[PDB]
Amino acid sequence: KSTYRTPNFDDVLKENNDADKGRSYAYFMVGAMGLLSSAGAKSTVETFISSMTATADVLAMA
Amino acid sequence: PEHDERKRLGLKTVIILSSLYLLSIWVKKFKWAGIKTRKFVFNPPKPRK
Amino acid sequence: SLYKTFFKRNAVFVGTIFAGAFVFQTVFDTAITSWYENHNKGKLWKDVKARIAA
Amino acid sequence: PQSFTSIARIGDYILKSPVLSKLCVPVANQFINLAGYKKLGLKFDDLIAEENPIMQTALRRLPEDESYARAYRIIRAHQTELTHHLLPRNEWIKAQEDVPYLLPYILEAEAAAKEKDELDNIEVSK
Amino acid sequence: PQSFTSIARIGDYILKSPVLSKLCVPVANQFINLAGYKKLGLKFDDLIAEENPIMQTALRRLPEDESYARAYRIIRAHQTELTHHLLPRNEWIKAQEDVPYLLPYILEAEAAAKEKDELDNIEVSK
Amino acid sequence: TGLHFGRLSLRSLTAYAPNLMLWGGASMLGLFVFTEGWPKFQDTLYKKIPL
Amino acid sequence: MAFRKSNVYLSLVNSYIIDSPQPSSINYWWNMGSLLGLCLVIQIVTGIFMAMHYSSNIELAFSSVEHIMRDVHNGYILRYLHANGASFFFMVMFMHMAKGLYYGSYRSPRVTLWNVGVIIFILTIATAFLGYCCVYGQMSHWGATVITNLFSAIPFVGNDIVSWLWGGFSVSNPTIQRFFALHYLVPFIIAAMVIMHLMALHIHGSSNPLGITGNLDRIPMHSYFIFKDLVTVFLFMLILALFVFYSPNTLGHPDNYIPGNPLVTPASIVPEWYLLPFYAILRSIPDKLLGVITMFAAILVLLVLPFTDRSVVRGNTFKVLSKFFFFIFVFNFVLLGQIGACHVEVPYVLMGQIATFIYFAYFLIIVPVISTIENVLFYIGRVNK
Amino acid sequence: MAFRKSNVYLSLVNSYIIDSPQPSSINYWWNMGSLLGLCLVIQIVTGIFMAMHYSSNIELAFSSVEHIMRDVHNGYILRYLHANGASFFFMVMFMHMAKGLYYGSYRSPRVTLWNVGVIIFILTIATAFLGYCCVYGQMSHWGATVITNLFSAIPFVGNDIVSWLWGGFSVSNPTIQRFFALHYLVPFIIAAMVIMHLMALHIHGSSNPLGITGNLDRIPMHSYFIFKDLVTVFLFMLILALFVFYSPNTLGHPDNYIPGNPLVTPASIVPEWYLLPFYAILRSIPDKLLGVITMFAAILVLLVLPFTDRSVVRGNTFKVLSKFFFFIFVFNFVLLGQIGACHVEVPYVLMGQIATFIYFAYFLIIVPVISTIENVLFYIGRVNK
Ligand SMILES: CCCCCCCCCCC(=O)OC[C@H](COP(=O)(O)OC[C@H](O)COP(=O)(O)OC[C@@H](COC(=O)CC)OC(=O)CCC)OC(=O)CCCCCCCC
Ligand SMILES: CCCCCCCCCCC(=O)OC[C@H](COP(=O)(O)OC[C@H](O)COP(=O)(O)OC[C@@H](COC(=O)CC)OC(=O)CCC)OC(=O)CCCCCCCC
Ligand SMILES: CCCCCCCCCCCCCCCCCC(=O)OC[C@H](COP(=O)(O)OCCN)OC(=O)CCCCCCCCCCCCC
Ligand SMILES: CCCCCCCCCCCCCCCCCC(=O)OC[C@H](COP(=O)(O)OCCN)OC(=O)CCCCCCCCCCCCC
Ligand code: HEM
Ligand code: HEM
Ligand code: HEM
Ligand code: HEM
Ligand SMILES: COc1c(O)c(C)c(C/C=C(/C)CC/C=C(\C)CC/C=C(/C)CC/C=C(/C)CC/C=C(\C)CCC=C(C)C)c(O)c1OC
Ligand SMILES: COc1c(O)c(C)c(C/C=C(\C)CC/C=C(\C)CC/C=C(\C)CC/C=C(\C)CC/C=C(\C)CCC=C(C)C)c(O)c1OC
Ligand SMILES: CCCCCCCCCCCCCCCCCC(=O)O[C@H](COC(=O)CCCCCC)COP(=O)(O)OCCN
Ligand SMILES: CCCCCCCCCCCCCCCCCC(=O)O[C@H](COC(=O)CCCCCC)COP(=O)(O)OCCN
Ligand SMILES: CO/C=C(/C(=O)OC)c1ccccc1Oc1cc(Oc2ccccc2C#N)ncn1
Ligand SMILES: CO/C=C(/C(=O)OC)c1ccccc1Oc1cc(Oc2ccccc2C#N)ncn1
């Protein structure tokens, strides 16, 4: 048939599009992921770095 | 001897890693929805070319 | 609008996920330690020392 | 790896035997229906691996109206696979449409490559 | 790095001064003879580094009879260098042949790039 | 009548005047989070009224 | 053009993980290769920080690991992530190779990619053997005694390869010191083979689960398969964290917390779980020279698969007989691992000999016969004659 | 085409050492880069074989090296080739960098190639510092005491970087064990930077001693520069063999055959010869914080040369004033090495302060002023006005 006729997309479309609500919820979930990934990567580096400080038997002879 | 400290540190790690797993499923399903609902139509071309 | 005050300006979208994660560390560690010690009350050394004072 | 000349030699021997075509041919019809490529809208000649010089020769010599229809069936099968669904039942390939359209072009290119190989490594006698 | 517009501005100021052209010009003639590029058969404009957009523009606009002669002088200087020798004395570049053949093409391309840069970062007033 | 020069612009920095306040502030927030639990950084950062 | 395509170092990054064309229909089995890259980084980084506190002398090796567990700040986290991370490395690698068998990824034009992967698998086995020796527990000493004594049955050179491997007359102090130095080196050779592995993959690209060409519908890597990779990265880290913090000694042997004693033999000498099927193949040949040859042939028989597969179709998706015998081979591999942890007793001796035959008959007998039959059934079910 | 151009792994070999177009007029100074590749292989291979016999505990480190010299078969050959090979590595690297200064190899379009080389030079200095600590001689202990104490003058973080570098309160047993583990690793990071160094070189090719374009006359690498490389490889090995077998302790200090004693200070604390000019720059600044900043600025000032050279001609071949001041800079570097081996006495204190100024004034004052003057002398000696 004619290429100007668009097929049926109605079982996935929102009843009201409302562009300032669809963008706001998607950016909440991406922002929460970057929040938790930065706090997780920070404690990971501090676990490896603090293993080079003085051990428990060295501190006992201080 | 680390037994009481290991179980307290494990509770913080499992809670953080569970939240990052559930958030990544939502973000992957949002960013793939244009590909998953794509539609194709075939019209056979005219011969003699 | 609350997209453009929270997630548009990506001089602090990198920033707020880097500063909200700083105060996140102390509130999260205080809440779990308080729950973990209340679940195990009567078994810690501080609960033992309070009546091995004799 | 096994050539189509060898497959057609074994297969035509079974189909001419009246006792072997009563045993193997009912088993082959159950094997194809359990394979399930027709429920994705494919013919069998769409499934042949093409990364070899014989298959590249046969795909060049295919008429262009059949080459356009082959490209649509492959694209539609990739989209159905990523959605983890099957096609609607009125869009399945029927058995009278599952014909070997590419097989005569493959067998012609195989016979020409065999004749060239025999003339390049050859003996003479006075 | 230093532009040829800046080099010509300093150099033409010295050459117009009658007291500065008596001091620096004898020193510059001893500097060129001690450099020794003329004993390999080169002019000075053969020695300019060419891996920049201004020099690629000026080399495209050179007439083709001068472009063929420049290519022969560069090739002859590479062959003399690997043999650890100098040219015969009757094949050295003379001072009246060491002319700046490429300098007007370089100065024209530099002035066009400066005018384009001034029009691209510009103010207005009502 | 003409602006600045040399592969940058004062016009490119008069719009980017008050946001390296926050792009520098993006990595003011960098060593904010990445420096925690050190014995170095607590006479100016643990003195605050909460937590 | 953009700077990610014009720079010399960023164009290698852009053509591999940003702009590389992927087939649109690959599933979650195609995510195992990037998990193996994360596992190799985890094993290398926890390895360096533990090596700052380790002593490789035979009088000091067992107490150095106990010093890491007790006195180093977060030292028990470094060891438990390292020991459990080696078991997770082998599990992801087994699933990655089984994906290649099922979908026909070994076939042309990807034979060089499959051959480099077999070299990587051999070097990973040798790495885990050398790190287990460095603990010098009771299972460390006697497991090294059993394996190194196999090489003395080689004719005319055997009794001099073993004493060159010992540095002496038995497993002793020069053996442990040279095994720790080799254990540092081989993960850097593995990292160079991974780079050669990714170069051969860039030439032809990946296959797809339908087995047919992917050149008609491609999507770029960035923000589609980057975010699909994040789902399996976080699930991997969560399950690994449950083992490190809540059950850290489930995948090990309690005899390795006894220090190594060359005068007391343990009641049972058992390897780690990921080397148990190759241990049962070795114990099923009574002659000692033929047993060590068959043990190394179990890895090298993976190279015959591009020549014994006779099918004109790539993969197992539309083949019902090849699907059945693939899962026969999978549960035969699990049974061989269970036999390798039992005593040498009736009826486990005959069961291990039949399961050893089924392993080698899959590559050399079953695959060329079944794929020839499936070629003919596709033909005569369509051709009218 | 031929198989050396169609294979995925051999085409990298063919485009680098077989078919790569070289300028026809390069001299023997362009052979130093391939000698540096041979030196890195020699240091890595002798390093692994010695590490099979080495103990890194502070009570065992000195006697382990004496055990290598006496009890290991050909063990004195392994150590003497390793220690003397480090001095030959620095001498070839100094001549390689001085070739780049003379011929203008740092200029555009080769700035990325010059910047990667400066990173390699920093990592090589850190490698040789860590290997000298592993001997634990008397010069090993007190040289590590002097250098690690410099970092405590950094504001607000200084007293906690040093104790994080010691693992304790001074140079002790955790310091030597972590320095040997870092010493194993950094040569593998150097090998990865060398691969990035060769990728940037393949893009533009080499320069030539005339300073002008080489695109008009090229000859391939194989059998011309392969056989020219063999002449300098055999001369290098002959001179290295004369030091290893006939004079093996000339380039070292006899105080390093005394075991490390933290209670007895030596009469003179002197580094190896290739670190002596940077030691004299540090001792010429009386304030302790500005002295360690100036010491690290002496390496980082190599990065300003693409911006301070103002000449329109590449190289020093036709410039008589730039030739004179290049050799002023070379003999100033030798004098700074000699001052660094003297006592802090009159008049060596003022001589080291003047020579430190001449080092930094070459890059920032002398090169932009002289190259501006030589631009003008070329102009007015030809133009008739
Ligand atoms: C060991 C430590 C490593 C940890 C990580 C390794 C993960 C290995 C898992 C094996 C694998 O990779 O293949 C998985 C395969 C499914 O592939 P598929 O693309 O056809 O399914 C897409 C789905 O329909 C949409 O999946 P969708 O993307 O829409 O949602 C994601 C889903 C979780 O996805 C994953 O975690 C993938 C592992 O989220 C939810 O379930 C929502 C409710 C919470 O599964 C199968 O084919 C058969 C299922 C059983 C396989 C288990 C065999 C293990 C030996
Ligand atoms: C730790 C030490 C490791 C030692 C390992 C070897 C390292 C050598 C380091 C010295 C060096 O770098 O030499 C470079 C320098 C090149 O600089 P240049 O441009 O002035 O001279 C072009 C080429 O030499 C002509 O040498 P020529 O080409 O004339 O030699 C003839 C022949 C090659 O002969 C030889 O093999 C002798 C070695 O080649 C032919 O032409 C015939 C072919 C048909 O050679 C020179 O001739 C200049 C002399 C100054 C050397 C002083 C070094 C100061 C440190
Ligand atoms: C020398 C080295 C030898 C290596 C041998 C490796 C053996 C180790 C065992 C690894 C198990 C991995 C088996 C699965 C391999 C993945 C490939 C595969 O089988 O495809 C997935 C299969 C196909 O499913 P679909 O039909 O929906 O997709 C078709 C494409 N369109 O979908 C499925 O059917 C998935 C079902 C998976 C069940 C497998 C159970 C495995 C149990 C092993 C337990 C081991 C610990 C005890
Ligand atoms: C972090 C900062 C690092 C600083 C790095 C500086 C390192 C300095 C250490 C010494 C390096 C040795 C310098 C070698 C000079 C290399 C320069 C070069 O590549 O060639 C220059 C010159 C070229 O001469 P031509 O062949 O072009 O002559 C033809 C007629 N025009 O060739 C010549 O003229 C060769 C003349 C011989 C030079 C003699 C130098 C003496 C060096 C004394 C070393 C003392 C060590 C104890
Ligand atoms: C692919 C990489 C690696 C694998 C598969 C691997 C595997 C192993 C295994 C299985 C053990 C025995 C663990 C136990 O049961 O206690 C071990 C121990 C050890 N490994 Fe590794 N390793 C790897 C990389 C490294 C590297 C690169 C280093 C050092 C730089 C290292 C240093 C150590 C040390 C010090 C031990 C002894 C401490 C301990 O027992 O945990 N490892 N390794
Ligand atoms: C440290 C080890 C390894 C790493 C990092 C690695 C990495 C990868 C990656 C990233 C891919 C592309 C994505 C994918 O298909 O998953 C891949 C593909 C592949 N790998 Fe590996 N791999 C490793 C080991 C192996 C081994 C042991 C084998 C086989 C014996 C192997 C054989 C293959 C094959 C055949 C493919 C192509 C699959 C296809 O295109 O369908 N690799 N590898
Ligand atoms: C670019 C590479 C290297 C350089 C420049 C270098 C340099 C040095 C130096 C200067 C010493 C002190 C030698 C002495 O005066 O006695 C040393 C010692 C040592 N190095 Fe290296 N090294 C390198 C690579 C390696 C590697 C890769 C290893 C180990 C795998 C290694 C293992 C050792 C050992 C065991 C010692 C102590 C034995 C001795 O004193 O000779 N080295 N190194
Ligand atoms: C392990 C260290 C190094 C290795 C293996 C190495 C290797 C090489 C090789 C093989 C070449 C080409 C042939 C030649 O011109 O000699 C080269 C060129 C070059 N290298 Fe290195 N190099 C190293 C260190 C350095 C350092 C420390 C610098 C400077 C700070 C440097 C800067 C350069 C430059 C500028 C060139 C281009 C020279 C020209 O084209 O004229 N490299 N290098
Ligand atoms: C200008 O044009 C040129 C050019 O003129 C030249 C000469 C070269 C070639 C010069 C080079 C220096 C390239 C070669 C590079 C190296 C030799 C660097 C070495 C690289 C490594 C990765 C080092 C690792 C090597 C090893 C041998 C370590 C492994 C050690 C082992 C296996 C021993 C341990 C084993 C046991 C059993 C203990 C060019 O590449 C080039 O560019 C196109
Ligand atoms: C088909 O399309 C694909 C595709 O699908 C995928 C998944 C990838 C995925 C790519 C990968 C998974 C990359 C592979 C992973 C590696 C090569 C990892 C290599 C490992 C290393 C480099 C280890 C290095 C580690 C260190 C140097 C750490 C050292 C420790 C230190 C320095 C301690 C610090 C010391 C002190 C004193 C603080 C592709 O590239 C690709 O394109 C082809
Ligand atoms: C041994 C395996 C090797 C594998 C190689 C993989 C590549 C790893 C690189 C990873 C990304 C690194 C980003 C580089 C940043 C951009 C490059 C750049 O800035 O080059 C230059 C500046 O030069 C430098 O300072 C180089 C910095 C050294 C980087 C060492 C890590 C940018 O300027 P340029 O205009 O020349 O870029 C175009 C180049 N064709
Ligand atoms: C980025 C720096 C790292 C890169 C290093 C590059 C240098 C690597 C070593 C080069 C040595 C050459 C190795 C042999 C080359 C022949 C390979 C071959 O014949 O290809 C295969 C055989 O497959 C293999 O078994 C490869 C084994 C690799 C072993 C390497 C350890 C057949 O050749 P093919 O027909 O595929 O050639 C076309 C390639 N596109
Ligand atoms: C040092 O002992 C190592 C062991 C281990 O499991 O390391 C991870 C081990 C312990 C007890 C008994 C045996 C052990 O080692 C091994 C080694 C091993 O090696 C091979 C694996 C596949 C093919 C060939 C070999 C060999 N040789 N196959 C089985 N067990
Ligand atoms: C462990 O002692 C190492 C020494 C050595 O020479 O190693 C090869 C050494 C011995 C005595 C005195 C000092 C020593 O070390 C050093 C280290 C050193 O390091 C640098 C070099 C250049 C720029 C900065 C630094 C620093 N820090 N510069 C000079 N001497």
Tab-separated table of N, CA, C and O and ligand atoms in Angstrom, chain H residues 40 43 47-48 50 54 65 79 82-83 86 89 127-128 131-132 135 180 183-184 187 274, ligand 7:
chain	number	residue	atom	x	y	z
H	40	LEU	N	66.100	-3.327	26.472
H	40	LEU	CA	64.926	-3.635	27.278
H	40	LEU	C	64.666	-5.137	27.346
H	40	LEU	O	64.214	-5.633	28.380
H	43	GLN	N	67.366	-6.563	29.858
H	43	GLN	CA	67.007	-6.299	31.250
H	43	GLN	C	65.817	-7.140	31.709
H	43	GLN	O	65.747	-7.515	32.878
H	47	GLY	N	66.278	-10.361	34.341
H	47	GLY	CA	65.515	-10.085	35.545
H	47	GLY	C	64.681	-11.258	36.031
H	47	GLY	O	64.560	-11.470	37.238
H	48	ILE	N	64.076	-12.019	35.108
H	48	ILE	CA	63.230	-13.149	35.501
H	48	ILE	C	64.071	-14.277	36.094
H	48	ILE	O	63.667	-14.924	37.066
H	50	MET	N	66.991	-14.156	37.613
H	50	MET	CA	67.490	-13.829	38.943
H	50	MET	C	66.377	-13.851	39.983
H	50	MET	O	66.629	-14.183	41.144
H	54	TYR	N	65.693	-15.016	44.436
H	54	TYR	CA	65.802	-13.815	45.254
H	54	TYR	C	64.766	-13.817	46.375
H	54	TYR	O	63.628	-14.247	46.180
H	65	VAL	N	71.514	-12.009	47.190
H	65	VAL	CA	72.314	-11.572	46.052
H	65	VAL	C	73.704	-12.202	46.107
H	65	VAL	O	74.276	-12.564	45.074
H	79	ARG	N	74.020	-11.484	37.116
H	79	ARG	CA	74.007	-10.236	37.872
H	79	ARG	C	74.821	-9.149	37.177
H	79	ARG	O	74.355	-8.013	37.035
H	82	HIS	N	73.205	-7.752	34.249
H	82	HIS	CA	72.053	-6.956	34.639
H	82	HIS	C	72.457	-5.584	35.163
H	82	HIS	O	71.839	-4.576	34.809
H	83	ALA	N	73.478	-5.528	36.020
H	83	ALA	CA	73.879	-4.262	36.624
H	83	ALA	C	74.587	-3.363	35.618
H	83	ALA	O	74.317	-2.160	35.561
H	86	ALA	N	72.143	-1.925	32.874
H	86	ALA	CA	71.366	-0.742	33.219
H	86	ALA	C	72.130	0.545	32.923
H	86	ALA	O	71.518	1.545	32.536
H	89	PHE	N	71.947	1.064	29.175
H	89	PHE	CA	70.606	1.504	28.800
H	89	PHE	C	70.467	3.020	28.914
H	89	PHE	O	69.860	3.660	28.050
H	127	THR	N	62.324	3.057	37.641
H	127	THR	CA	62.669	1.636	37.640
H	127	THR	C	64.048	1.400	38.244
H	127	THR	O	64.215	0.538	39.110
H	128	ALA	N	65.045	2.180	37.817
H	128	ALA	CA	66.413	1.990	38.296
H	128	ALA	C	66.565	2.359	39.768
H	128	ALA	O	67.430	1.807	40.451
H	131	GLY	N	65.199	-0.888	41.742
H	131	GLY	CA	66.089	-2.035	41.703
H	131	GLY	C	67.327	-1.865	42.558
H	131	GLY	O	67.842	-2.842	43.103
H	132	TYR	N	67.816	-0.629	42.688
H	132	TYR	CA	68.951	-0.345	43.558
H	132	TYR	C	68.606	-0.550	45.028
H	132	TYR	O	69.482	-0.915	45.817
H	135	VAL	N	68.993	-4.441	46.518
H	135	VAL	CA	70.265	-4.985	46.981
H	135	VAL	C	70.345	-4.926	48.502
H	135	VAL	O	70.837	-5.860	49.146
H	180	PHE	N	60.273	-4.246	45.742
H	180	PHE	CA	60.572	-5.321	44.806
H	180	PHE	C	59.361	-5.672	43.952
H	180	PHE	O	59.516	-5.992	42.770
H	183	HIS	N	59.060	-3.124	41.341
H	183	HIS	CA	60.165	-3.216	40.405
H	183	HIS	C	59.905	-4.261	39.329
H	183	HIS	O	60.456	-4.176	38.236
H	184	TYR	N	59.067	-5.244	39.627
H	184	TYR	CA	58.689	-6.264	38.665
H	184	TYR	C	57.742	-5.686	37.594
H	184	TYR	O	57.846	-6.045	36.413
H	187	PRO	N	58.649	-2.223	34.323
H	187	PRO	CA	59.124	-2.587	32.970
H	187	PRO	C	58.055	-3.128	32.025
H	187	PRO	O	58.254	-3.071	30.809
H	274	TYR	N	74.424	8.055	36.244
H	274	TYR	CA	73.399	8.586	35.353
H	274	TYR	C	72.325	9.396	36.077
H	274	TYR	O	71.496	10.017	35.410
I	7	HEM	C1	64.010	-1.702	32.348
I	7	HEM	C2	64.249	-2.737	33.150
I	7	HEM	C3	65.166	-2.785	34.402
I	7	HEM	C4	66.086	-1.932	34.902
I	7	HEM	C5	66.586	-0.567	34.360
I	7	HEM	C6	66.609	-2.521	36.117
I	7	HEM	C7	67.570	-1.982	36.946
I	7	HEM	C8	68.106	-2.575	38.070
I	7	HEM	C9	69.202	-2.065	38.857
I	7	HEM	C10	69.963	-0.756	38.572
I	7	HEM	C11	69.431	-2.915	39.861
I	7	HEM	C12	70.539	-2.776	40.925
I	7	HEM	C13	71.688	-3.629	40.387
I	7	HEM	C14	72.941	-3.576	41.214
I	7	HEM	O1	73.592	-2.507	41.266
I	7	HEM	O2	73.303	-4.617	41.803
I	7	HEM	C15	68.492	-4.013	39.750
I	7	HEM	C16	68.389	-5.112	40.584
I	7	HEM	C17	67.527	-6.181	40.443
I	7	HEM	N1	66.554	-6.309	39.471
I	7	HEM	FE1	66.321	-5.063	37.861
I	7	HEM	N2	65.971	-3.724	36.324
I	7	HEM	C18	65.077	-3.915	35.295
I	7	HEM	C19	64.238	-4.998	35.129
I	7	HEM	C20	64.048	-6.034	36.022
I	7	HEM	C21	62.999	-7.026	35.978
I	7	HEM	C22	61.905	-7.025	34.875
I	7	HEM	C23	63.173	-7.847	37.038
I	7	HEM	C24	62.403	-9.093	37.552
I	7	HEM	C25	61.522	-9.833	36.890
I	7	HEM	C26	64.342	-7.407	37.752
I	7	HEM	C27	64.860	-7.988	38.888
I	7	HEM	C28	65.900	-7.508	39.654
I	7	HEM	C29	66.499	-8.159	40.793
I	7	HEM	C30	66.071	-9.534	41.355
I	7	HEM	C31	67.469	-7.372	41.266
I	7	HEM	C32	68.373	-7.682	42.482
I	7	HEM	C33	69.589	-8.498	42.050
I	7	HEM	C34	70.726	-7.591	41.664
I	7	HEM	O3	71.162	-6.769	42.501
I	7	HEM	O4	71.205	-7.695	40.512
I	7	HEM	N3	64.844	-6.300	37.112
I	7	HEM	N4	67.699	-3.758	38.650
